[PDB]
């Protein structure tokens, strides 16, 4: 949690983010594998700074198997040295239509994500991620017997406050109705629960949430908020899962369940 200047060999670039680049690396002492996130700079630059900083502050206190870990910080640009999750992100995996994820594995993924969010929500005060979407779910392993299959990543937009937070969120297909409207109304970690419903939906169907509809942006947002528009749950969905998704994506945040219930229900599938 103290810096790590050098001691890191770069191996390859694996991604990009809101504030910089992401590379796969090795450590010399152990040679253990790692991921490095750099910060590369009204202003956009301030948002980038704030985001990098926010990820560090939030991640600084977290330790859970289903949460990417922060290992150290670096100072030359600067950088966050984190856990390397080798199977990539969920969004890309789901695009491989020819190789559907095995049902047992889908369940592992759902549970693992729920456990991570449950842990976020049990913090004092609770953490609201605000960016829970498939690109931000990383895959440790697709083996149904692995210790960990999925981890929550990218805490750049995260808040951890005693009160409700606010701020308009884009990526409306993944975000709660109370967070996407033009008037900047307040919300809570119940917003993340809604996003999780959409994560459940994407895993279940292998489809992007709301991809079945086509509307202009204003109409789409109004539909989600004022008409209760939601993705259609397939007929073949197991009843207990259908129930969890429906409750989680309730228009009323108060109706979205506590993760103790969500985790118990998912475990029954
Ligand atoms: C071997 O590790 C990966 C491979 C990929 C991957 O499958 N690639 C295939 C196509 O070229 C780019 C990398 C990936 F997207 C993410 C990987 N791992 C990983 N591990 C940790 C993180 C991090 F920063 F959040 F802590 C992360 N961020 C993703 C890249 C934006 N990615």
Curated annotation (Swiss-Prot):
Organism placement in taxonomy: Eukaryota, Amoebozoa, Evosea, Eumycetozoa, Dictyostelia
Similarity section: Belongs to the protein kinase superfamily. TKL Ser/Thr protein kinase family. ROCO subfamily.
Active site: 131
Full protein stretch here: 1019 to 1292 of 1726
Protein kinase domain boundaries: 8-269
Binding site for ATP: 14-22, 37
Protein source organism: Dictyostelium discoideum
Protein name, as recorded: Probable serine/threonine-protein kinase roco4
């Amino acid at each position: 949690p103290t810096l790590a200047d050098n001691e890191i060999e770069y191996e390859k670039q694996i991604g990009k983010g809101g504030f910089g680049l992401v590379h796969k690396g090795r450590l010399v002492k152990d040679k253990s594998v790692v991921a490095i996130k750099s910060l590369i700079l009204e202003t956009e630059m301030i948002e980038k700074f704030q985001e990098f900083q926010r990820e560090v502050f939030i991640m600084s206190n977290l330790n859970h198997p289903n949460i990417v870990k922060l290992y150290g910080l670096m100072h030359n640009p600067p950088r966050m040295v984190m856990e390397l999750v080798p199977c990539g992100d969920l969004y890309h995996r789901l695009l491989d239509k020819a190789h559907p994820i095995k049902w047992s594995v889908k369940l592992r993924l759902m549970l693992d994500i729920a456990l991570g969010i449950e842990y976020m929500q049990n913090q004092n005060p609770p953490i609201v991620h605000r960016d829970l979407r498939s690109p931000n779910i990383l895959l440790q392993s697709l083996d149904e017997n692995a210790p960990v299959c999925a981890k929550v990543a990218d805490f750049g937009l995260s808040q951890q406050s005693v009160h409700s937070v606010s701020g308009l969120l884009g990526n409306f297909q993944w975000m709660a109705p109370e967070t996407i409207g033009a008037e900047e109304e307040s919300y809570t970690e119940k917003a993340d629960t809604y996003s999780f419903a959409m994560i459940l939906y994407t895993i279940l169907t292998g489809e992007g949430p709301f991809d079945e509809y086509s509307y202009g942006k204003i109409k789409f947002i109004n539909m989600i908020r004022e008409e209760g528009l939601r993705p259609t749950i397939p007929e073949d969905c197991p009843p207990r899962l259908r129930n969890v998704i429906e409750l989680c994506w309730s228009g009323d945040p108060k109706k979205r369940p506590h993760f103790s219930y969500i985790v118990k229900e998912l475990s029954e599938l």
